[PDB]
Amino acid sequence: MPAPLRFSSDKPLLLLIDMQQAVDDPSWGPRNHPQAEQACAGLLQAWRARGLPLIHIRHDSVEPNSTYRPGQPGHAFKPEVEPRPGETVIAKQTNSAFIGTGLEALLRANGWLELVVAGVSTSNSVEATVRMAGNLGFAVCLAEDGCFTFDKTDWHGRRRSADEVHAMSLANLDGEYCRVCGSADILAALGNI
Amino acid sequence: APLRFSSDKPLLLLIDMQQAVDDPSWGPRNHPQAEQACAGLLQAWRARGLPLIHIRHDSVEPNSTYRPGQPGHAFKPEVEPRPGETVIAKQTNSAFIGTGLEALLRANGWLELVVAGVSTSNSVEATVRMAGNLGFAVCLAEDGCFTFDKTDWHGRRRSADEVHAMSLANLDGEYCRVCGSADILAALGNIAGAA
């Protein structure tokens, strides 16, 4: 059998993506993983309690009707994963957390080459970020139970449920770009550091 | 509204159309005419003298169908480069990473890209997501793309068609405009009159 998950470094970095109140609009259709916030909160608490590196990514927009524009309620972090004073928050304007943000240079300057990723949506900004992270040479564990996405019509006109959308993105990501795993296994690997 | 190029120099970017992808190990594919659609685009680009780049995938992994110096590494004959044409080799999924692609495009003002190749959901999608987020105007010629069957993370066997359809839906609007090669070829004919 495969060996249990083990971190190669003593400083894996938790990267939480776009966990902002905007995504709670019921108009964005059904989501999967109703306890994703709780899974992310558990990772965040563990990282904080161990003094491990962590970065919150959040999405900004200049579009005047965007729920992500400054001052709008949707732009705020979800309270379950609200940053603390002094924690690193990096804002982005496109899907990938690397583009226009200086994230790669910051990670490399600090030796943070192993990433634990969670957030929303699995298939949009999470996937965009993870594909680039893997191809840039980062070792990525995607905590899939801390991720969620939404129902989406495919190009042939078939409604795919959020679960289906999630499952197809994970299948495209695993092996090729990252190791897909669960938060419980990640938390267990911390104890081995 | 029917497709219209914003520039007079859209660039054709053909991704990883190498004999490797014919290996039955990849599993079943969709879009059996993708090669012919790509050949039609390539011939039109050549005939019109428009910008074009072939992206080639290279591996140092001993088991890969794209391992250099064996037949799978060669371009498919339908879309084989010709002398003087730009070929950029990559070692990861995205055509931007570890190559000079972005800088080359920007130095020449090649901000509008027409993309086709293989696989829709792997290297094509990785390249297109980055292109769109980098600010390139991308038209994805979906009939010139193909992919393979894959089992989703919940055990459901998806056909190549279904995989393709899901990637196109994720790509369209957010990262690119999905369209057909016939659309694209018609739009080339309208450039001159828009000058």
Side-chain angles (χ1 to χ4, degrees), chain A residues 77-102:
Chain A
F77 284 102
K78 289 169 153 281
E80 295 91 341
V81 289
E82 179 160 274
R84 280 178 35 87
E87 289 181 343
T88 303
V89 177
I90 294 176
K92 70 183 177 65
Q93 298 180 88
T94 203
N95 305 99
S96 172
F98 292 94
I99 291 177
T101 61

Side-chain angles (χ1 to χ4, degrees), chain A residues 159-180:
Chain A
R159 176 195 291 254
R160 295 297 192 199
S161 70
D163 302 80
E164 289 173 317
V165 175
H166 184 91
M168 288 181 83
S169 287
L170 294 183
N172 287 343
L173 289 171
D174 187 55
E176 196 76 350
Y177 302 94
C178 70
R179 181 174 177 159
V180 173

Side-chain angles (χ1 to χ4, degrees), chain A residues 19-24 66-79:
Chain A
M19 289 289 275
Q20 290 160 274
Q21 294 179 26
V23 309
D24 297 331
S66 177
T67 60
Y68 291 99
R69 74 187 190 275
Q72 294 302 302
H75 183 259
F77 284 102
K78 289 169 153 281

